[PDB]
């Protein structure tokens, strides 16, 4: 329905300020259309991350701020490690583990610096 259509026309999603969108480009928004962001991986969402293509233009992009905290480095995994790191480790970060040989992970390669603490890991397996 026309909920608030006058519907100009919009293609792709704005940029965010020091984040960006995660969402791929569909050109053919046009209106109501709704786009989430996120933010960098040393920069924390301090904004709504969702915005949507009004009659005009989108709506009030969200904001990214630097939460300046660091997870210290990679953990340990039973029988994994790392494939990359790159220090210092700040929330919204990530890093990808690799499982030993022999060994076979279950769960995320990548994980994800929250509050201190990597997302969760995988777990290896003996094969």
């Given at each position: 329905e026309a909920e608030a259509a006058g519907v100009q026309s919009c293609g792709p999603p704005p940029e965010l300020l020091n984040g960006n969108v995660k969402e791929k480009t569909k050109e053919e928004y046009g209106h109501s259309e709704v786009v989430e962001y996120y933010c960098n991986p040393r920069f924390l969402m301090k904004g709504p991350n969702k915005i949507q293509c009004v009659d005009g233009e989108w709506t009030t992009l969200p904001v990214c701020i630097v939460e300046e905290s660091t997870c210290g480095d990679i953990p340990e995994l039973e029988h994994g490690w790392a494939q990359l790191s790159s220090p210092p480790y700040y929330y919204g970060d990530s890093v990808e583990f690799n499982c030993s040989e022999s060994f076979t992970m279950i769960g995320h390669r990548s994980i994800t610096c929250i509050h201190?603490?990597?997302?969760q890991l995988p777990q290896c397996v003996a094969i």
């Amino acid at each position: 329905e026309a909920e608030a259509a006058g519907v100009q026309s919009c293609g792709p999603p704005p940029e965010l300020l020091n984040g960006n969108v995660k969402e791929k480009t569909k050109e053919e928004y046009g209106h109501s259309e709704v786009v989430e962001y996120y933010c960098n991986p040393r920069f924390l969402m301090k904004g709504p991350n969702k915005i949507q293509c009004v009659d005009g233009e989108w709506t009030t992009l969200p904001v990214c701020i630097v939460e300046e905290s660091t997870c210290g480095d990679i953990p340990e995994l039973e029988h994994g490690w790392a494939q990359l790191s790159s220090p210092p480790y700040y929330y919204g970060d990530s890093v990808e583990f690799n499982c030993s040989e022999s060994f076979t992970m279950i769960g995320h390669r990548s994980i994800t610096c929250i509050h201190g603490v990597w997302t969760q890991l995988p777990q290896c397996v003996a094969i």
